[PDB]
């Protein structure tokens, strides 16, 4: 695994010595290399993970999600590139020195073997985002935004950690394929209840279950682009994969203990999108968006049937990729506009053609149009919760019209009407702003002729 | 010469235990051979040396 790990950190050499005129040239050519060189993980094994060493493996579930973390990393430097250009040269490299850093702790988050570094690499993904949104954030809200953020993903992770350590002295390993094979049943006592909550909550507050929610709001909105795109792209996944893993060893109890969440998302899904039916803020009501979305993850988690999980793994993905596009694009209306509002800046249709039509495949494949990846995921959900209860569909099915509905919405506010007399700075769209809409729909896309890389390890 | 020490030769048995002592608690096992290394070095987590 060593093969994407050294170029990752040689990243930051390499950019800390390049002449001030090529920081971003050379970060994008080789992070595209790197994002190139992991490409080489989605060859697995039809039951059997790919175990590089005793430090790290990858199975059917960590290669996607480290493939898309490779693939987002030169999206974020593109996205990036036009507000961070009158910065000095010192801190433009801090700040590719932060996402890099971000990076290699995704990547060895997904490629750890054991639980306790698993947590400690997630939790260490904390500093570099906090710092890339107290920074470079433009509102005064990014202070708030930021401690929110930290300290809702520390009150959840603490313990996390404990119940990592109770488990270690317990059954002598945290080894992922140790405590896999070597699973025992969990009593119904208080004391595995409150372990599994220990487990379950850390994951919960990552991908923001209905409740635990309000730091997503603040930290997409206040949060720089690529702050953002990584916000919503993969550190959202990583409660997903953190709880695709752990749930081995919660069961029975979850049957049990998974209701409360159960509820919590499945009707915090229909919030989240009534919600976004009337936002007034873009990059709040993408969040929003993001929120409902994950809850979907959240249930198909907490089913644990192989559909759901499938479904899950492919949501994943799909999600990361519309929720970083359509927040590439609020960027692109918001650096012409100077303003997050939704209803500022209309018509839009008439002075950028091929922004809006970035805009309407965008929404497409948010609103689950088949037979993109995102409906596969959603699809394969939802029939997983069909099996569960036939009561799910009502609200499965009112998800979707709500989400069709709020999509298409932001589409004709944004994208449609008469244009806004008084605005005069809307310039052409930019080479660089159309490849990274280009780069962000075109895997999407071809994801569709081989859904089986992104449908997990159960497939 | 009334301070020296002096020998006195008596024919009482010297006392084998004046202080009435218990027995002495066994000692604890003293050591052993020589020393190999940690099986797969420290176990700590996931540091595998």
């Excluded at chain 1, 480290?66 to 433009?92: F, G, I």
């Excluded at chain 1, 920074?135 to 992770?157: C, K, P």
């Excluded at chain 1, 997903?240 to 049957?255: A, C, E, Q, S, V």
Aim: hydrophobic residues 50%.
């Amino acid at each position: 695994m060593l093969k994407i790990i050294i170029p990752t950190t040689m990243l930051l050499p390499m950019t800390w010595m390049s002449k001030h005129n090529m920081i971003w040239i050379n970060a994008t050519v080789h992070s595209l290399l790197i994002s190139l060189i992991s490409l080489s993980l989605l060859n697995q094994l039809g039951e059997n993970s790919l175990n590089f060493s005793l430090t790290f493996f990858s199975d059917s579930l960590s290669a996607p999600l480290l493939v898309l973390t490779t693939w987002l990393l030169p999206l974020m430097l593109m996205a990036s590139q036009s507000h961070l250009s009158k910065e000095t040269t010192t801190r433009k490299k801090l700040y590719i020195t932060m996402l890099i850093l971000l990076q290699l702790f995704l990547i060895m988050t997904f490629t750890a073997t054991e639980l306790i570094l698993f947590y400690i690499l997630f939790e260490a993904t904390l500093v570099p985002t906090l710092i890339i949104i107290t920074r470079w954030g433009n509102q005064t809200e990014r202070l708030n935004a930021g401690l929110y953020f930290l300290f809702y993903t520390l009150a959840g992770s603490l313990p996390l950690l404990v119940a990592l350590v109770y488990i270690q002295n317990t059954t002598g390993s945290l080894n992922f394929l140790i405590i896999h094979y070597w699973s025992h049943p969990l009593s119904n006592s208080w004391s595995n209840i409150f372990m599994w909550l220990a487990c379950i909550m850390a994951f919960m507050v990552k991908m923001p279950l209905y409740g635990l929610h309000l730091w997503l709001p603040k930290a997409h909105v206040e949060a720089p682009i690529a702050g953002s795109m990584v916000l919503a792209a993969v550190l959202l996944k990583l409660g997903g994969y953190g709880m695709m893993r752990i749930t081995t060893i919660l069961n029975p109890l979850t049957n049990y203990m998974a209701y409360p969440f159960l509820m919590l998302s499945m009707w915090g899904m229909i919030m989240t999108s009534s919600i976004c039916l009337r936002q007034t803020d873009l990059k709040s009501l993408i969040a929003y968006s993001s929120v409902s979305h994950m809850a979907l993850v959240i249930v198909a988690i907490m089913i644990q049937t192989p559909w759901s999980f499938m479904g899950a793994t492919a949501l994943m993905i799909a999600h990361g990729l519309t929720s970083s596009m359509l927040f590439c694009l609020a960027n692109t209306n918001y650096e012409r506009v100077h303003s997050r509002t939704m209803i500022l800046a209309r018509g839009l249709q008439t002075l950028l053609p091929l922004m809006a039509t970035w805009w309407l495949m965008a929404s497409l494949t948010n609103l689950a149009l088949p037979p993109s990846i995102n409906l596969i995921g959603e699809l394969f959900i939802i029939t997983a919760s069909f099996s569960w209860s036939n009561i799910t569909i009502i609200l499965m099915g009112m998800n979707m019209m709500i989400t069709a509905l709020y999509s298409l919405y932001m589409l004709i506010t944004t994208q449609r009407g008469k244009y806004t007399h008084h605005i005069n700075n809307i310039k052409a769209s930019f080479t660089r702003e159309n490849a990274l809409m280009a780069l962000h729909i075109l895997p999407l896309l071809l994801l569709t002729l081989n859904p089986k890389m992104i449908l997990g390890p159960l497939y | 010469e009334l301070s020296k020490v002096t020998k006195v030769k008596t024919d009482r048995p010297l006392p084998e235990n004046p202080y009435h002592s218990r027995a002495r608690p066994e000692p604890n096992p003293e050591a052993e051979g020589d020393l190999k290394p940690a099986k797969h070095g420290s176990r700590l987590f996931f540091w595998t040396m």
